[PDB]
Design a protein around this ligand. Sequence first.
Ligand SMILES: O=C(O)c1ccccc1Sc1ccccc1S(=O)(=O)N[C@]12C[C@H]3C[C@H](C[C@H](C3)C1)C2
Lengths: 206, 205
Amino acid sequence: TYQYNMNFEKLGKCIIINNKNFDKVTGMGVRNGTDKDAEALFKCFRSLGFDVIVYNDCSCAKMQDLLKKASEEDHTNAACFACILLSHGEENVIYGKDGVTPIKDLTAHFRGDRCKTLLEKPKLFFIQACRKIPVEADFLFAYSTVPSWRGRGSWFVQALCSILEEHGKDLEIMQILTRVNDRVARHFKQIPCVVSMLTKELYFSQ
Amino acid sequence: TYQYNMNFEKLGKCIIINNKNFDKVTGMGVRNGTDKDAEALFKCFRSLGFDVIVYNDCSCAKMQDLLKKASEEDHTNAACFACILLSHGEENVIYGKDGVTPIKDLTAHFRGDRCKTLLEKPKLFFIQACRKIPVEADFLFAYSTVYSWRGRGSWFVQALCSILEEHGKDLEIMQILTRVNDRVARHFKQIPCVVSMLTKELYFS
Ligand SMILES: O=C(O)c1ccccc1Sc1ccccc1S(=O)(=O)N[C@]12C[C@H]3C[C@H](C[C@H](C3)C1)C2
């Protein structure tokens, strides 16, 4: 009634996009520790139940392509869809190897009026970068820093993954991300932000 | 450990700001039924434990001031502090009688480096736009929209109050708001947004 329904063949796709290396032209730098964060995330979301795919040094044009192609896929048998972005960022834009794409444009592909197969199911978006059913319902964003600090990993992620490894299967999504906020805030300063359009409670299990 | 602490003399002040009437020179419109919502809200946050106070048709002047005066008060005996805005809106700006004041201005007053006594305590902001602890930690915003549609109440408020009317004292803040995001979407379509920098679970008891 109040859980999001999990009685699905699969938990879902989980697209990690690990941009470490950027063209000189951007002025952005090699992002060190991102590899440690893709691994943490890759493994954590494997354990959860997600069919993880890690993209690497992904270009703005292939960030926009692979998410569109992922939204055109059939999700009829998936409980949700996660997507995880590990790049550089500015107000309302994630970076690629060749430039910047608006984050809203990347997520738009999974809107209800486009990705009918992910209707009524959580669309999760986690971002580590420096900054008659409605369509935008059943979305959720976890940005690393309120409008992002990290070779020994990054704070938001080291923490996100710690918390999923233990309570990931026994705690609601907001209970988790909240605990990730306290962890980042106390020590790991910055504070992570969480936007929820979710209309139900998201447990990754039973 | 993981719940926010409520063992305080008071739950906190709750400033409701009910802009129904907007000046001619300003171009904004009557938001009619905001008084049904403000009252709806007055009772809900009254039952919860809040010292709700309703100011009506404020100036952008009065708002930024009225929130500055509020941040400077003493909360050592308060568990949190609530605030509710019922005006017209556009992007990162709230409206008044004389114009618009950016919302960051209203909230900044309660940042960790300003209001030492509401530190590590929930700062709650509910907003209906019709059309080593960090500084920005422990705020929560509930916008009514990501338009926002409304006499006879408005959808966002109607639901928020219903859900609190019952589950206010036995449900975490995010669970409540998650239900308020469901009712607004299905029963009526638009969707409310919820921003949490909370670092703990917020129960009103
Ligand atoms: O500094 C505080 O006032 C502040 C204090 C505590 C929490 C957040 C903030 S900011 C703020 C305040 C109110 C509502 C939303 C935000 S926000 O988290 O989304 N931050 C921005 C930062 C810039 C100015 C304005 C519009 C846009 C760009 C986003 C607020």
